[PDB]
Amino acid sequence: DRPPISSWSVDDVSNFIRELPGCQDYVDDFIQQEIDGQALLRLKEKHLVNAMGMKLGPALKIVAKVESIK
């Protein structure tokens, strides 16, 4: 279904974000910031909202999904 998150490429992460409800508008940002699986595991709400300028709802959903998978 999904290989380990630590093995995900930047392209893999972009597809993951594309399929998360309400997060499709941020796909280009993840690609531009070169967020691969190892980086995704380290992303906190503060980085998403403050560093990436994301709205709180989408930011919370991303962190939560990663936590559930991990």
From Swiss-Prot:
Effect noted on mutating residue 69 to D: Little effect on Scm-binding activity
Residue span(s) of domain SAM: 8-70
Reported effect, residue 8 to A: Significant loss of Scm-binding activity
Compartments it resides in: Nucleus
Tissue/organ expression: Salivary glands.
General function of this protein: Polycomb group (PcG) protein. PcG proteins act by forming multiprotein complexes, which are required to maintain the transcriptionally repressive state of homeotic genes throughout development. PcG proteins are not required to initiate repression, but to maintain it during later stages of development. Component of the PcG multiprotein PRC1 complex, a complex that acts via chromatin remodeling and modification of histones; it mediates monoubiquitination of histone H2A 'Lys-118', rendering chromatin heritably changed in its expressibility.
Assembly and binders: Component of PRC1 complex, which contains many PcG proteins like Pc, ph, Scm, Psc, Sce and also chromatin-remodeling proteins such as histone deacetylases. This complex is distinct from the Esc/E(z) complex, at least composed of esc, E(z), Su(z)12, HDAC1/Rpd3 and Caf1-55. The 2 complexes however cooperate and interact together during the first 3 hours of development to establish PcG silencing. Interacts with the SAM domain of Scm via its SAM domain in vitro. Interacts with Trl in vivo and with corto in vitro.
Protein name: Polyhomeotic-proximal chromatin protein
Portion of the full-length sequence here: 1506 to 1575 of 1589
